[PDB]
Amino acid sequence: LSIPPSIQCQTEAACRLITRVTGDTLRAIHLYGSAVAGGLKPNSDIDLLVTICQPLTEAQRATLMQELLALSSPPGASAEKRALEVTVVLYSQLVPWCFPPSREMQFGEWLREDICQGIYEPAQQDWDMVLLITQILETSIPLKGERAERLFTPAPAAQLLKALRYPLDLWQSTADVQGDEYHIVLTLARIWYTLSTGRFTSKDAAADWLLPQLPEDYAATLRAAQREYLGLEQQDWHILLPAVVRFVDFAKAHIPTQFTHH
Ligand SMILES: CN[C@@H]1[C@H](O[C@H]2[C@H](O[C@H]3[C@H](O)[C@@H](O)[C@H](NC(=N)N)[C@@H](O)[C@@H]3NC(=N)N)O[C@@H](C)[C@]2(O)C=O)O[C@@H](CO)[C@H](O)[C@H]1O
Ligand SMILES: Nc1ncnc2c1ncn2[C@@H]1O[C@H](COP(=O)(O)OP(=O)(O)OP(=O)(O)O)[C@@H](O)[C@H]1O
Ligand SMILES: [Cl-]
Ligand SMILES: [Mg+2]
Ligand SMILES: [Mg+2]
């Protein structure tokens, strides 16, 4: 797998920073997500997983958070300077697996306001870490350390199922989805795709896979979500919000409850 030339400079800067702060504790840095698996759009972020051996000191946490702010920009602000998402995890949480796994920290542009004031999310449980590692074992590039298949072990299918279906419970009310309308719709398409095929695919490809299988009313909602993500039309998602809720409820009712495996 290859790093897109148009992100190499920023990725190299992020790696030099991570190396400085972590240093002796650093086990690996893996690039994953659309930059590697495909689907890198103008607003897409650069997804990075940092594996360390010991927890981050609050000095390391503060420094890494602050200095990442200078290497990252909000999505869409710049074609050259993309949004960074850096997730840090203890190796001991993955080998052997701890369920749910915990993450030491997660930098992201949606936290810029808080990070600009010394407010850092602490370590916490995150079922999504099961999905991250699973996707990394399939499609990732080691910027530092060993390839993923030599560092991590796959999770049991039983736990991958729980991680895939866990977000379905977070989305129940209008406010649970308000603000992330098309992101949630496309993510549901990816969850549906993975549970039915055992594979991971891009947001765009998951929507195309799902559209023919939906009643037209729900296909229209998925189409509007896909259309916005691709930059072809911005919708008024306050108007579409009742239809988004109906789409979420349809997915929760129809997504498989067991693998049709990875
Ligand atoms: C970790 N990736 C970022 C994060 O994504 C999250 C995103 O999570 C969002 C929930 O759906 C939404 O209901 C939730 N909204 C509520 N009313 N509770 C958001 O707060 C939540 N975002 C968050 N905690 N950062 O949906 C999940 C499927 C996700 O992709 C997990 O990995 O947050 C998204 C923005 O919310 C960013 O666009 C992503 O880059
Ligand atoms: N079935 C799934 N397939 C892929 N990702 C999933 C799935 N279910 C949940 N997710 C989560 O959704 C998030 C997607 O991250 P992200 O928004 O960076 O997507 P991406 O593929 O990098 O596309 P983009 O170019 O928009 O960044 C991840 O945190 C991932 O764990
Ligand atoms: Cl329904
Ligand atoms: Mg991404
Ligand atoms: Mg991301």
Residue numbers in the entry: 3 to 262, 267 to 268
Copy the relevant paper text.
Brief soaking of WT AadA–ATP crystals with streptomycin resulted in a 2.05-Å–resolution structure with clear density for ATP, magnesium, and the major part of streptomycin. The overall conformation of the enzyme is very similar to AadA–ATP (r.m.s.d. of 0.3 Å over 256 Cα atoms) and AadA(E87Q)–dhs (r.m.s.d. of 0.4 Å over 256 Cα atoms). Absence of electron density for part of the C ring (C2″, C3″, and the methylamine) suggests that this part of the substrate may move within the active site in connection with catalysis (further discussed below). In the WT structure, Glu-87 is positioned to coordinate both the magnesium and the substrate 3″-hydroxyl position, using the same side-chain oxygen in the manner observed in other adenylyltransferase structures, at 3.7-Å distance to the 3″-hydroxyl. The geometry of the substrates in the active site is consistent with a single-in-line displacement mechanism as suggested for kanamycin nucleotidyltransferase and LinB, but the two substrates are too far apart to represent a catalytic state according to this mechanism. Thus, the nucleophilic oxygen would normally coordinate the magnesium ion and approach 2.5-Å distance of the ATP phosphorus atom during the reaction, whereas the position of our 3″-hydroxyl in AadA–ATP–sry is at 5.1 Å from the α-phosphorus. It seems necessary for the substrate to move, possibly linked to a local conformational change of the enzyme active site, to allow the deprotonated 3″-hydroxyl to coordinate the magnesium ion before nucleophilic attack. The weak electron density for the reacting part of the substrate in the AadA–ATP–sry structure supports dynamics in this part of the substrate.
